[PDB]
Design an enzyme around this catalytic site. Sequence first.
Site, PDB file in Angstrom:
ATOM      1  N   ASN A  11      42.562  44.081  42.096  1.00 22.77           N
ATOM      2  CA  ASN A  11      42.886  42.928  41.250  1.00 22.77           C
ATOM      3  C   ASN A  11      42.081  41.709  41.651  1.00 22.77           C
ATOM      4  OD1 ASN A  11      44.185  41.689  39.125  1.00 22.77           O
ATOM      5  ND2 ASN A  11      45.812  40.839  40.412  1.00 22.77           N
ATOM      6  N   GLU A  37      38.186  46.864  39.946  1.00 20.62           N
ATOM      7  CA  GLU A  37      38.441  45.490  39.519  1.00 20.62           C
ATOM      8  C   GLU A  37      38.010  44.460  40.554  1.00 20.62           C
ATOM      9  OE1 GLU A  37      41.302  44.071  36.582  1.00 20.62           O
ATOM     10  OE2 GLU A  37      42.491  45.818  37.176  1.00 20.62           O
ATOM     11  N   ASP A 150      41.667  54.359  38.968  1.00 21.22           N
ATOM     12  CA  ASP A 150      42.795  53.882  38.168  1.00 21.22           C
ATOM     13  C   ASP A 150      42.651  54.524  36.794  1.00 21.22           C
ATOM     14  OD1 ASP A 150      44.654  52.441  36.641  1.00 21.22           O
ATOM     15  OD2 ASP A 150      43.796  50.483  37.187  1.00 21.22           O
ATOM     16  N   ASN A 152      45.051  54.534  34.591  1.00 25.98           N
ATOM     17  CA  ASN A 152      45.756  53.710  33.634  1.00 25.98           C
ATOM     18  C   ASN A 152      46.739  54.520  32.769  1.00 25.98           C
ATOM     19  OD1 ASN A 152      45.806  50.875  33.634  1.00 25.98           O
ATOM     20  ND2 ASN A 152      43.567  50.882  33.489  1.00 25.98           N
ATOM     21  N   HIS A 247      48.198  46.767  42.462  1.00 23.60           N
ATOM     22  CA  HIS A 247      48.160  48.182  42.839  1.00 23.60           C
ATOM     23  C   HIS A 247      48.180  48.296  44.362  1.00 23.60           C
ATOM     24  CE1 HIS A 247      46.436  49.766  38.845  1.00 23.60           C
ATOM     25  NE2 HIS A 247      46.220  48.462  38.747  1.00 23.60           N
TER      26      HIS A 247
HETATM   27 MG   LIG Z   1      44.478  45.159  36.737  1.00 22.72          MG
END
Ligand SMILES: [Mg+2]
Length: 260
Positions: A11, A37, A150, A152, A247
Amino acid sequence: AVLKIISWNVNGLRAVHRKGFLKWFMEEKPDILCLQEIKAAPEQLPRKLRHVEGYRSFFTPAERKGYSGVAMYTKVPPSSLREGFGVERFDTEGRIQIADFDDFLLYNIYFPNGAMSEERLKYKLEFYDAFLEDVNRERDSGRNVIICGDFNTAHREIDLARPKENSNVSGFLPVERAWIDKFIENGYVDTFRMFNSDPGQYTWWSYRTRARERNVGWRLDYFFVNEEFKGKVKRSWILSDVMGSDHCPIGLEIELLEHH
Ligand SMILES: [Mg+2]
């Protein structure tokens, strides 16, 4: 002998840096660290994040400023790094690293979030299809593959705290779950579930009051291998106590090939 691989959607790399990322990294000592990210221009990272002693680092940023981006830090140099599937619209979003470690290819993928619009859900599902064509091509050529990042999507009801309330939202749509079923049926294994069949095993919690504390989470982050390679997976775990992002990291220990 084994290699420890960690995957973590941070993040924002600068954001996690400010909370203690390098101290964690030094304590955990992964052989390979895959991040999603990053959200930063690599030349605007502080040089102590850009380069860490004992590792080679690779950054694959998006064209869009402040968005997406993946990175890999590795104690052993790969023989090549491929940053796309060969399709422009999937390859400019900072989502794909495919590093060749000779024993295996390592895919570090930030798969799209489809929750903001039908447009982006369609992009996610098309990205899924391009990924599957890619990994199958490599596997079929004789390579072992490790895929982390990830995805998702929470695969089954056990993979999120509130399945019934999320039937109609990207992250737990029937069509997304069905794609994970298809990927597995193409001969890939969700390594966490080789070793852990328990509930409450999540890797993402909304950044909202006490969601993480209450463990109101989703398993969005995975390590997959091709079937033929699963006997080399020795551990697959969630680093649920590691803070600093919405996360948490996940881990894999893979045994090195033993040539005879
Ligand atoms: Mg995110």
